[PDB]
Amino acid sequence: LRRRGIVVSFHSNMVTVEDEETGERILCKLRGKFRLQNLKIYVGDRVEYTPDETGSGVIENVLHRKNLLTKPHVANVDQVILVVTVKMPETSTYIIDKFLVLAEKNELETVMVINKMDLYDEDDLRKVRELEEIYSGLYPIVKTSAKTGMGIEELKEYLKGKISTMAGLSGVGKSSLLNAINPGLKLRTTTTAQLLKFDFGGYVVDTPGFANLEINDIEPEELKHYFKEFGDKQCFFSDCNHVDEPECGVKEAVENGEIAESRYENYVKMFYELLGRR
Numbered sequence: 342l343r344r345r346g347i348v349v350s351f352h353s354n355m356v357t358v359e360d361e362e363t364g365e366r367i368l369c370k371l372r373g374k375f376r377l378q379n380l381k382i383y384v385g386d387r388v389e390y391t392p393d394e395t396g397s398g399v400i401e402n403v404l405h406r407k408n409l410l411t412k413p414h415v416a417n418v419d420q421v422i423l424v425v426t427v428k429m430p431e432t433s434t435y436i437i438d439k440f441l442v443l444a445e446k447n448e449l450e451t452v453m454v455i456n457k458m459d460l461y462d463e464d465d466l467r468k469v470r471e472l473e474e475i476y477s478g479l480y481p482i483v484k485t486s487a488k489t490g491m492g493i494e495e496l497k498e499y500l501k502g503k504i505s506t507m508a509g510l511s512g513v514g515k516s517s518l519l520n521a522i523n524p525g526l527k528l529r530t531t532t533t534a535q536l537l538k539f540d541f542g543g544y545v546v547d548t549p550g551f552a553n554l555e556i557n558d559i560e561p562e563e564l565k566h567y568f569k570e571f572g573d574k575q576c577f578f579s580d581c582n583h584v585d586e587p588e589c590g591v592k593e594a595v596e597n598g599e600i601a602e603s604r605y606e607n608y609v610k611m612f613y614e615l616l617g618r619r
């Protein structure tokens with residue numbers, strides 16, 4: 342009879358589902374009119390199927406998704422674990438804000454993780470204090486070391502229950518942190534993502550988030566809504582883009598220091614970058 346499950350991967354041209362109750366990995370086939378209609382199914386999709394245990398099962402229906410990450414297709418993602426690096430990979434605030442813009446656009450909770458702390462000397466630490474100085478009040482920050490183990494237990498606290506996606510520049514330590522959180526687990530024909538179950542309940546995606554940092558589906562005038570800070574600020578004009586406009590609460594805030602310059606700076610850069618399109 343009808344049982345609820347979460348899709349976790351696509352094996353041998355078939356959907357692999359996991360039983361929401363207390364189930365194992367039941368392989369499946371989608372039947373019905375999903376054919377007639379165009380109701381596509383993805384990893385992370387919640388579904389209800391028929392347990393013909395005498396050989397896997399059959400997917401009867403696919404629930405409605407809260408969202409759908411793209412390239413590595415993933416549905417119903419709650420969190421973005423943004424792993425950042427001050428030294429070694431060197432992460433610019435610009436890249437960081439593009440990541441946040443993306444996480445916000447897909448309406449996801451974001452947890453910023455400054456990794457490789459074990460490698461930082463005094464100058465590096467200063468750069469760290471600058472990251473906290475910028476993002477402290479906009480997002481949760483956790484200082485970690487995949488090697489030392491520093492900050493992992495605290496990070497396990499955010500992964501619990503939720504379906505999470507790792508994001509960050511190559512080399513920043515995404516796969517190493519994963520293994521630090523759950524020995525054995527690791528980041529990545531077979532072009533679809535997979536959901537890895539955490540020891541403590543919850544899942545993390547096979548491959549990394551928006552690795553292609555593609556901000557195009559965003560209209561210029563839309564971008565401003567993806568910078569938390571820009572909101573409680575009042576600007577003269579109706580829907581002021583905060584760039585040239587004559588009077589801007591946002592521009593005012595920057596001259597004050599209520600808004601980090603880097604934030605404004607990167608937002609404007611991104612703004613103009615989106616304008617170049619017809």
Ligand SMILES: Nc1nc2c(ncn2[C@@H]2O[C@H](COP(=O)(O)OP(=O)(O)O)[C@@H](O)[C@H]2O)c(=O)[nH]1
Binds near residue numbers: 456489509514515
């Ligand atoms: N010292 C130190 N090295 C780390 C840390 N995390 C990852 N690394 C190293 O950084 C390299 C890249 O890590 P990896 O997890 O593969 O990066 P990813 O591309 O973000 O998944 C590997 O050679 C690791 O040995 C960390 O917290 N501290």
Ligand SMILES: [Zn+2]
Binds near residue numbers: 577581584586589590
């Ligand atoms: Zn404005």
